[PDB]
Symmetry: C3
Subunit: 228 residues, 3 copies
DNA sequence: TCGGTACAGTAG
DNA sequence: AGCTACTGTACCGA
């Protein structure tokens, strides 16, 4: 909103625009930041009471750990490698099927505070963003192919809605790709901006940030240390 | 009342069923999109509430449809299958000593000519019974069966055993576990009789499941059998 | 004493490089501190052993009858073993207490129950010194104290005091990734409600194990031959 | 309680 | 960011 490339450079020493999604600089820029693919944890509610669910508390401590250590752990598994492997082919096939042009984007922060950001799978020539998924199980691709909007995983929905909150955009493509499918290997939908989600982020996210600052202060740390 | 023949299998898959051995390439091919004994508990599963299909049933529903449309199936539980493969012969040789019946290895067996439903027994016995001979990856699981008997693990395996009897049209089935790590007495088994309650469940539930699969396949322009051609 | 253990296991405690074949052999069939939570687990209503408890029951019986144990946490143990020396050194500096490394400790001659402390302290306390695989877990404890992790570790700590007949126990976490202040610890006092729980539930669990072993023609001790 | 299913939680 | 896959608790109707 008042975010500028210079602010990023002065705080992190990193030139945004030169960041090629997945490189050392990209990992560095996400440290301690409430990000799209993880925000489902922030909006998670107890079924009774007000006590934070374990998944919310776990993400809370994960972000704080990133601030105080200045690092994030690396995990590897077949499903993760699969998604990484076919992302490029998914995007190309999406462009060919939909007829829209996709531009790759590095991280996008909501504002100058750098507390909140998303890393879109692409930005489209029609003003929509793009999220791709390449399910490791053909089962889960089939679930999306047959069910569509109502079949979308709640984590992906929170991720897509958060991306619209961050970028101030109004619509986001959600595409699934399976290279193993003989036919019908690509399926996508358009997810509209949901103001119920926007209201939820406007309420829960700033409170999550204040809670983090309180926690950092208790232990003698301050947000930003991960970048110095 | 099956009208299934080896020629039907050969024409639509290209595979000689008589040459099939459990775990081979042809074995895996012949199981694509097919409702199998080890997975049927998903098909006959009932909701926690309401009248809709339970989550686990919808998952298997999507799993089988995916096999039809991709022509492949992922290899899960590699460690346990390799363990079972390593001790297949020893288990069988010990089972034959203890029981006093001879075991003949079997290819995949389909219920009927539609090739929608099948089982793969660990052997067929000289007394007319089929055989399930597991080599549990964890000794804990062997011990559970050793001490609790049939009643302890009926939740996990009764459906599978009954389905094998539904497929083969047999009246009884051996359910056995072998654990080579046991210092002595590493074989335990029970005999399970054909249960007509389970047979009635398969007769009403399975065909409906098949019909809903064909509906979904048609919705995306696929037909059962594309996995084999 | 080591000579009694040597006579019954064929393993000399003074040796044991950890965690070798002999290290794992000593725990076979033994109710251990980090697994005791399974023994003390109750159903929400009634008296039937919950699945966790039955699972552990069968796991232990399998260890006696097979004389082997599967190995988990290859990644987590490799992390801990790398930093165990630096963890202890920093704990000694912070606490002002000196730590002696301790082999396995059995509660009694029956050798049915044991704990494996990360050290025995000069003030008389025991030590649990963990290097959590995630910095997330370090932070949970750093900010929440023992209230944040009592769910997971109170049983293990209390059981260790039950086994050793000690009155207090250090619970510490070390994280080398922390830019500063990478050691956090609390002192946990002996809880007599936990002691009473063990005095009741542990003996009956052992009795039920021996009953099952006798049913299948096995006896405790066979794993060490 | 029994005999199960749904899903939070979390490793990898 | 990447997507399961397994464990254990919550939950549900009889
Ligand atoms: Cl222990
Ligand atoms: Cl121990
Ligand atoms: Mg992405
Ligand atoms: Mg994606």
């Amino acid at each position: 909103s008042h975010m500028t490339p210079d602010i990023i450079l002065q705080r992190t020493g990193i030139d945004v625009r030169a960041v090629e999604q997945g490189d050392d600089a990209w990992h560095k820029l996400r440290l301690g930041v409430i990000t799209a693919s993880e925000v489902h944890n922030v909006i998670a509610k107890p079924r009774s009471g007000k006590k934070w669910p374990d998944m919310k508390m776990s993400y809370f401590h994960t972000l704080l750990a990133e601030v105080c250590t200045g690092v994030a752990p690396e995990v590897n598994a077949k499903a993760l490698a699969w998604g990484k492997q076919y992302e490029n082919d998914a995007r190309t096939l999406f462009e060919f099927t939909s007829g829209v042009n996709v531009t790759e984007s590095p991280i996008i922060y909501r504002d100058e505070s750098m507390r909140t950001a998303c890393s879109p799978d692409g930005l489209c020539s029609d003003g929509n963003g793009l999220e791709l998924a390449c399910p490791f199980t053909s089962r889960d691709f089939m679930k999306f192919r047959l069910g569509g909007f109502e079949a979308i995983k709640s984590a992906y929905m929170a991720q897509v809605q958060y991306s619209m909150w961050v970028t101030r955009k109004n619509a986001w493509y959600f595409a699934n790709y399976d290279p193993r499918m003989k036919r019908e290997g690509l399926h996508y939908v358009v997810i509209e901006r949901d103001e119920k989600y926007m209201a939820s982020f406007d309420e829960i996210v700033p409170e999550f940030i204040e809670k983090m600052d309180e926690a950092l202060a208790e232990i003698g740390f301050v947000f930003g240390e991960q970048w110095r």
